[PDB]
Ligand binder design. Structure first.
Ligand SMILES: *[C@@H]1O[C@H](CO)[C@@H](O)[C@H](O)[C@H]1NC(C)=O
Length: 332
């Protein structure tokens, strides 16, 4: 079909960046591809923080096709511990040789100096891939606009994450058994804002910690760590502690620690210790954090390095003839 591939680079932390061209003649940026948001942000030459001067900065004055917005302004977003601010504009984008004209985006003009998250990462922008309901500026999100202008591309994208060999890639318009084995298990999206599906049960080893009431998983490629709500996290940290992981005993800990099982009807997503434990300098720490999502507080995030390396994930946008779905398959 019209399927095409966008190579992905893992820099540090977890977030995955790909090549995006902006403007005429094209300027190159390497934004995060984020299923947890919907806007496009691009770091520009108006940002004079040192955390901005160190990265590639888009210059809107060098783009023939850039049109600054007169009526939309003062776009501001919290960015983890940090925050970004800027203005609104429109330009032509290119992703994997596919053109996207008249695309509205945020121009970063200021990054917080809070430690300071922008010092730990190499941030050049964000391509949001969530649903239209989270769009802040402009009247059409990036992926929606690309599909409108490339109508033979099927409305879906998938992430193949293989950081051990630099072979990670974002696939648009379809899927391939080059990246997965077994069946694809389709999970219906319940609410079209985040890619959010029903979670039936969650086990830590043999201990069921969920669910007696409707609960949710959000597939968020912009998060590094998987999450649990407050109550389950107290259970988790009583069951799973940081531990010495030296050359002598780390394989022992990876075999011994419990498997975490997410149950979605027939699909069981299993995370082994090698997935959710982070080895750093002779110590293993569990890669889970406490996140409580308002309406909710029954939402669990699944994101990047730990989970997506072992599971090929397919994001199927609903159309006039099908609902939105998340497909999960065993990676490789
Ligand atoms: C871009 O915008 C101009 C003016 O608003 C319009 O005439 C043109 O058709 C648009 N192009 C696309 C591909 O939407």
């Amino acid at each position: 079909e019209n399927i095409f591939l966008v190579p992905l680079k893992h820099l540090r932390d977890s977030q995955f960046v790909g090549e995006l061209l902006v403007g005429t003649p094209p300027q190159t940026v390497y934004p995060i591809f984020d299923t947890g948001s919907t806007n496009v942000w691009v770091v520009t030459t108006a940002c004079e923080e040192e955390s901005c001067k160190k990265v590639r900065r888009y210059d809107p004055n060098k783009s023939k096709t850039f049109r600054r917005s007169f009526i939309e302004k003062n776009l501001h977003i919290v960015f983890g511990s940090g925050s970004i601010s800027g203005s609104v504009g429109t330009d032509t984008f290119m992703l994997g040789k596919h053109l996207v004209r008249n695309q509205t985006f945020g121009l970063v003009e200021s990054e917080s100096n809070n430690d300071n998250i922008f010092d730990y990462i190499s941030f050049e922008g964000i391509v949001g891939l969530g649903f239209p309901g989270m769009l802040s500026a402009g009247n059409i999100p990036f992926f929606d606009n690309l599909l409108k202008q490339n109508p033979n591309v099927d409305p879906q994208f998938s992430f193949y994450i293989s950081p051990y060999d630099g072979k990670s890639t974002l696939i648009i318009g379809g899927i391939s058994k080059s990246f997965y084995e077994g069946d694809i298990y389709m999970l219906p999206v319940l609410k079209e804002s985040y890619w959010e599906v029903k979670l039936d049960e969650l086990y830590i080893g043999k201990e069921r910690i969920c669910c007696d009431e409707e609960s949710y998983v959000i597939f968020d490629t912009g998060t590094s760590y998987n999450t649990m709500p407050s109550s389950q996290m107290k259970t988790f940290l009583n069951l799973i502690h940081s531990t010495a992981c030296t050359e002598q005993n780390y394989k022992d800990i990876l075999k011994s620690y419990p498997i975490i099982k997410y149950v979605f009807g027939e699909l069981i997503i299993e995370l082994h210790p090698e997935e959710y434990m982070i080895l750093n300098d002779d110590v293993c720490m569990p890669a889970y954090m406490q996140i409580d999502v308002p309406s909710r507080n029954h939402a669990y995030l699944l994101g990047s390095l730990s989970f997506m390396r072992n599971f090929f994930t397919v994001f199927v946008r609903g159309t006039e003839s099908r609902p939105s779905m998340v497909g999960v398959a065993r990676a490789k």
